[PDB]
Amino acid sequence: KRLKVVAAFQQSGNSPMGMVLDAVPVIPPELRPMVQLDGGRFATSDLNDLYRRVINRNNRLKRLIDLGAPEIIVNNEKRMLQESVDALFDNGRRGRPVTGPGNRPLKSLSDLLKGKQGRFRQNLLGKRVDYSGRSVIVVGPQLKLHQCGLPKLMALELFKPFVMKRLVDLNHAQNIKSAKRMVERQRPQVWDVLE
Amino acid sequence: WLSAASFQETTRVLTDAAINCRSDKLNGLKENVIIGKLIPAGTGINRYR
Amino acid sequence: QAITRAMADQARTIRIPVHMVEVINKLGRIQRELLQDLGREPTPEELAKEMDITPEKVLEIQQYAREPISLDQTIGDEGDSQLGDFIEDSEAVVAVDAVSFTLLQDQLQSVLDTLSEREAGVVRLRFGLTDGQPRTLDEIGQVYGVTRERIRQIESKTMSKLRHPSRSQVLRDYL
Amino acid sequence: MLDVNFFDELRIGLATAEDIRQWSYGEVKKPETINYRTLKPEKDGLFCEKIFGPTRDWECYCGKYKRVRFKGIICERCGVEVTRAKVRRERMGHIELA
Amino acid sequence: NSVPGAPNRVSFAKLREPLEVPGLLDVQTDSFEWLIGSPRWRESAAERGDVNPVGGLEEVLYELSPIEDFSGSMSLSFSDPRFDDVKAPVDECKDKDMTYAAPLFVTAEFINNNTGEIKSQTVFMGDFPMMTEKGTFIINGTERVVVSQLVRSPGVYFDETIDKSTDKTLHSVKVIPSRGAWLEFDVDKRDTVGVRIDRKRRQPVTVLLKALGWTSEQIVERFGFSEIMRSTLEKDNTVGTDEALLDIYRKLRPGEPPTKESAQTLLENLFFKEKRYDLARVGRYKVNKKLGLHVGEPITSSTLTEEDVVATIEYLVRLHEGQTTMTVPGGVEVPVETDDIDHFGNRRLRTVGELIQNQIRVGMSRMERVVRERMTTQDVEAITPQTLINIRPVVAAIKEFFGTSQLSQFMDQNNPLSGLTHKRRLSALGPGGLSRERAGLEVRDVHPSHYGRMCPIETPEGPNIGLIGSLSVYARVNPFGFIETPYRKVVDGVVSDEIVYLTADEEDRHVVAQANSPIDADGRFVEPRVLVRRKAGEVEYVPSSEVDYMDVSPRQMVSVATAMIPFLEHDDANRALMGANMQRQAVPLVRSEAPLVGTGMELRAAIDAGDVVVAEESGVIEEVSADYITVMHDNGTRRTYRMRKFARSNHGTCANQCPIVDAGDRVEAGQVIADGPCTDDGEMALGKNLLVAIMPWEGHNYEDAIILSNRLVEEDVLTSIHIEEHEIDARDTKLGAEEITRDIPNISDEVLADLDERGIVRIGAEVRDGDILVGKVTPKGETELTPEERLLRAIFGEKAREVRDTSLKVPHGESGKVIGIRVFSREDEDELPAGVNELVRVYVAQKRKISDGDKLAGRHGNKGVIGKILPVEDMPFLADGTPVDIILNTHGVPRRMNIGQILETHLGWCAHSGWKVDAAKGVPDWAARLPDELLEAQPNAIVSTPVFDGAQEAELQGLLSCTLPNRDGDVLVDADGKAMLFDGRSGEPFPYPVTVGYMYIMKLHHLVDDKIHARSTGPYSMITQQPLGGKAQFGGQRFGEMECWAMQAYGAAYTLQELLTIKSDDTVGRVKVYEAIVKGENIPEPGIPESFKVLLKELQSLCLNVEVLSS
Ligand SMILES: [Zn+2]
């Protein structure tokens, strides 16, 4: 058992210093955006909250140390820093999850990766696509094998730029923007050209 | 490690992936899928490409 | 005291000064008491009296009392999607504008070049489109060796002949 | 790191302090994100514009340079590099532990 | 019959009812009544358990009073939970978005125990929300429904398991009090006991009994024969009462120093104090019955005691010893039988009352916290009841319950049924409920203890199959809330009219008998061997005189929506589920034909639904009008009824209430005043009655595709009105305010044609998709004015137009006339929140004439979207020259056990043509036990058929004999059933006779006008550049991994690179392809996408350096 790790580190140019930590990354703020909803109401990713907790922990630990305090309180603060970084990397690993407002668990980095919600199985293994649509189906007996019925409006809003251009070079709309408004208003000309 | 970590126990496997300096070949099928590169199957192999 | 200051200035996701959060807490106190003192929620037009501050200040106080929310909390009846899933990146390129912006910029060359080249260059720096600095007519005198009033004359020579619909008919589709 | 999609081998490994502070564009030391009035990041706040770069495209903290003609220039008052707002996605920061 | 306005709906009933059908709103009504202190409940409680007529209000008030201080010198006590009148009527609160409610008041008692002072301060508690007669609470105006829940009655539930090592049968118990920490006693792999308390496995009962103040003495006075515990006291390895106490402490309060009294008093504070371990009152009662401890006493002291636990341990051990009667020394005996859960005897029913009083319990828990907080920091004699009480935690507690607690969900309303049957819902999920993934296979099952209690058929067919339940019809709500079902009891072969309510555990000491036997009316059974249910739920034969209980009557174990399917007994229980659930999804049409063939419950089930206006009081009909109907009571006064027309439903439909009354006719207490959206003559009517021929028509009704008679479309026989509202909210801003007028930036002429000046459409504006509905014009903001547009505004002469028009355009695929506007405003001096100066609700309706893709369905699960509808030209006709109503596919019928809809088909044929079963010389053999007046019928008639006690197959065979036609001489269905048809296309006959007859059909709320989404390119996600999800937002389609699998299996790599790179996530390429097919050029080489780069940022952000080597 201990071989599989000690040898792996021996061969690898990897120092088990990194397995203990003294500096922490800060993911780019947009990836943890502090975004405002329509009309002042905001929204955070709660990662900013974990960073807040760790920042305050370290700040007060310094304040004690910079001042020089009784030991046991410093021991408590140091454990608190351990806990805060633990949550940051993994909420809910040791002891209870770090629940926030209204008694709900928060989200940590290690959560962003797991299961049908983590990036792998939620946003890299499967993703949402433009130029697409969905509608109910009906039987298409009057078709041939290769042929498939298509709600014309669905086809239009699928084939939007194509019809845009095609009538633009038929000059039914001078420039592309005129054609965009044409399609939006759904003038008759867009239909034959859709065909 | 990328394929397995993109299969199950995302963290546990990622641990030893990090430990063992496992450089992924960036060549596997599911690899190409994630990285947005063309997969090595069907019309993706260099012979057809 | 330490807990008061620490909560006031460090327990807020968005740190607020002691005075503003102080009035906010005073509001949460006096209004919450006034609810029972009134048999009803105390109205803001009334709450503004007790602080002897204008109602608009009271409402700013309240609008700073409301706090940010979390982007990942479940929204569906079951847990299948988060709030962050409904948010739009405001910085998205419409990608019709971009193509149409290129078309604007190209119709610009096609129209300027069909105009005189002296004038085309005059405007290219007057509005400073190809550069970062729009220019005044006395900078143009060096580059074009003529009195600034002559560029005052040329600006209208551009615009009015442009104001012939021939240039306008092909450009009015660009809005 | 420039990523023109010419990739051969993806490496995963532990990161040291000399790596984390190597990636960062400063150290963040103040637990703040938003100004409740100016709605801006603070000096070394969790969204510090200086650290992660500008939000307003080609417009620094004081907007000493609000034009793309200034590009890459680091303002002499705030130090916010004048560049694209995309870096706030690209750049990252760090905290040093006591 | 037994109804003041019902028509004659003759049926084939076999027996009479010892009791009629109960009020079908008795799930919310009684619960809330008992919650309040209603005078009805005041008398009912003072006669059915008057030891404590106490609503949740009074009850919680008393469990809370009297709050003391840390010392006991000063205290506060409560009394008089008093109500007040509501703040406005139902629609008014809904009209102006207010929570229907009434104020509450209470009289405090500020008792300074030190010396004695009193303040009987009548403290305002807030505005407590109140219940409407329909049980539907209004929140902020919105209608919401509190669904009933099932839960575990707290206590000790003894269980058995295998060790699968020596195959020993081991026994344990879950000591389960409401608000209790776990303590687990069992016999382990060995014969010792595991006494692990709160999941900490050491210290068997030696730490337990000795720590009670005991030593081995009292223990061995009980455990000399208990070998399971003799070893424990022999493996004591320690001595001491306080020693066992500290061992608890070492295993229940470790991590903190002990002391000789800290555990010595902690073990009292844990279970023998009432502030951390308190099983419910009915829980105390349940155990009283389980172990037999208490047998004549009222309930108090939810805090755990000592007598119970000794009985518990001895029951566990004598079960491990496989005994038959454990009797803890000092009381009555009880048998040795394992404690089931899923048998309703242990599954109680937490209704609205319990939920609300519990939320109030916790609200006043925090209120007591604040009372004590302000009882100390505030000076003595400087404190009054008002200052002690923070009622915020009270009002919050309810509102946080009401708001955003899935036990208080949206009121669903697209038909009267979805209004009703949404109540009387017995949910399994929630706080105290079990989550779906935790909800295993067994719990989903239909326990034998559901008979009569829960509907065994009407369950959701999604992932909640078996979890969410619905009430029966005849069921009852217990004061405790344990399910109660009325039944007759056969005593010595005397099935009594006695309506004896029992729950499940009240069967295991009883025996329920067959429901429809040759009962001579003497109360005996003709045959000894009758199919009864034995105590364990076993259903077998038992002699006539031996069983003790008989059922009340058929359609007792069934719900209402299920009770609207004629021939349920001929329909697969599977498909019956589909039909019942679809009956909740019908859409409000404009006729609502009553079924020619239905069930007698429909008439009852409609008036009880409130969706039918009633003559609450008898007296003459003064007058009839479309806006009101005045019933002049015989005594001076009248009753004016103001009707509800074009009031949008909770699911965007109408609540139309048409009158079927006469200007002078006497109306009775309980007779219709107006039919509702899906009712006629006061019985439910969700659809229409249509002649059939299930011949498959040229592959357009193939595989669940349906073809209809186009008359029905041109007639709009099956067509639905669809109201909708777009909400337009203009708020306060630093840009200014979004002044809704007809000040439109850059607007043409034809687009203002049907618009009124005041910023909206003309009320009654025919509008369409994308049509501008409301001009919510906003200021635009800052931007660099492009030089081209600068030249334009210099060249043609238009203004900057610096206003951002955030108007409403009808989003994709909506249209129809505009109803009107509901506008509230700040200048109107209204209660708009801080900023919103205009709240607008414009209303657009469209009567969506049906089309293919719209989901229709019958009453037996037969369902599907319309494949096609051709004109009447090619419609085969009977020997009456008649093209038929409806044509379906046959192949669904054989493979789905669903000839039942054909059974109703044919009987509806008979009910449409009439019959006269010829009693020429004697009643025909079928006609004999076939009830009377079923020998007679005239064309175009209406009937019913009970779910299990209906028109048997042979009876129907007798209904075909006399097949007297409607008009011509045409007996088309022979005595055996089939009819003949001639094709309407060919004019040429089919080889075999073709089926016909009358089917009920209805339109389902799954329109292809609602379920289409298209997108070339909309907006994109926040973090990733990926699109969003939803039809509301332009959204975008999801391409999953499981699609990627086949996607590669095709080998189509380039298309997959397309999918994940540019079709999702490459910005510049997305513009490139825009550039490609705005340049009319082939889409060129793919780019490299953003979310992939966002993937990289995510990964780099993971405290691990990563660099892909090019080389
Ligand atoms: Zn600057």
Curated annotation (Swiss-Prot), chain A:
Domain of life: Bacteria
Subunit structure: The RNAP catalytic core consists of 2 alpha, 1 beta, 1 beta' and 1 omega subunit. When a sigma factor is associated with the core the holoenzyme is formed, which can initiate transcription.
Induction of its expression: 6-fold repressed by starvation.
Described purpose of this protein according to its UniProt entry: DNA-dependent RNA polymerase catalyzes the transcription of DNA into RNA using the four ribonucleoside triphosphates as substrates.
Protein name from the UniProt record: DNA-directed RNA polymerase subunit beta'
Family: Belongs to the RNA polymerase beta' chain family.
Gene name in the database record: rpoC
From Swiss-Prot, chain C:
Domain of life: Bacteria
Subcellular location: Cytoplasm
Region (Sigma-70 factor domain-3): 22-98
Induction note: Constitutively expressed under all conditions tested except for 3-fold reduction in stationary phase, standing culture and upon growth in H(2)O. 2-fold induced by starvation. Half-life of over 40 minutes.
Chain segments annotated as coiled-coil in the UniProt record: none
Region annotation Sigma-70 factor domain-4: where it falls in the sequence: 111-164
Residue ranges of DNA binding: 137-156
Record note on quaternary structure: Interacts transiently with the RNA polymerase catalytic core formed by RpoA, RpoB, RpoC and RpoZ (2 alpha, 1 beta, 1 beta' and 1 omega subunit) to form the RNA polymerase holoenzyme that can initiate transcription. Interacts with WhiB3 and probably with RbpA probably via its sigma-2 region.
Function of the molecule: Sigma factors are initiation factors that promote the attachment of RNA polymerase to specific initiation sites and are then released. This sigma factor is the primary sigma factor during exponential growth.
Note in the entry: Was identified as a high-confidence drug target.
Protein name per its UniProtKB record: RNA polymerase sigma factor SigA
Entire protein: shown range: 353 to 527 of 528
Curated annotation (Swiss-Prot), chain E:
Outcome (variant: K119A): Does not affect association with TRCF, but weakens interaction with CarD
One example of a Gene Ontology biological process annotation: response to antibiotic
Signal peptide: none
Result, substituting L407P: In strain: vr2; rifampicin-resistant
Outcome after substituting H422N: In strain: vr6; rifampicin-resistant
InterPro entries: DNA-dir_RNA_pol_bsu_ext_1_sf, DNA-dir_RNA_pol_bsu_external_1, DNA-dir_RNA_pol_su2, DNA-dir_RNAP_su2_dom, DNA-dir_RNAP_su2_hyb_sf, RNA_pol_bsu_bac, RNA_pol_bsu_CS, RNA_pol_bsu_protrusion
Record-linked Gene3D superfamilies: 2.40.50.100, 2.40.50.150, 3.90.1100.10, DNA-directed RNA polymerase, beta subunit, external 1 domain, DNA-directed RNA polymerase, subunit 2, domain 6, RNA polymerase alpha subunit dimerisation domain, RNA polymerase Rpb2, domain 2
The reaction(s) this protein catalyses: RNA(n) + a ribonucleoside 5'-triphosphate = RNA(n+1) + diphosphate
Transferase recorded as keyword: yes
Keywords carried by this UniProt record: Antibiotic resistance, DNA-directed RNA polymerase, Nucleotidyltransferase, Transcription, Transferase
Effect of mutating S427Q: In strain: vr9; rifampicin-resistant
Listed result of changing S408T: In strain: vr3; rifampicin-resistant
Annotated GO MF terms: DNA binding; DNA-directed RNA polymerase activity; ribonucleoside binding
Consequence the record notes for mutating H422R: In strain: vr7; rifampicin-resistant
Cellular component terms per the entry's GO annotation: cytosol; DNA-directed RNA polymerase complex; peptidoglycan-based cell wall; plasma membrane
Statement: the UniProt record of this protein carries the keyword Protein biosynthesis: no
Effect of S120A: Does not affect association with TRCF, but weakens interaction with CarD
Superkingdom of the source species: Bacteria
Effect of L429P: In strain: vr12 and SP22; rifampicin-resistant
EC number: 2.7.7.6
UniProt subunit comment: The RNAP catalytic core consists of 2 alpha, 1 beta, 1 beta' and 1 omega subunit. When a sigma factor is associated with the core the holoenzyme is formed, which can initiate transcription. Interacts with CarD, TRCF (Mfd) and RbpA.
Similarity comment: family membership: Belongs to the RNA polymerase beta chain family.
Described purpose of this protein according to its UniProt entry: DNA-dependent RNA polymerase catalyzes the transcription of DNA into RNA using the four ribonucleoside triphosphates as substrates.
Descriptive protein name: DNA-directed RNA polymerase subunit beta
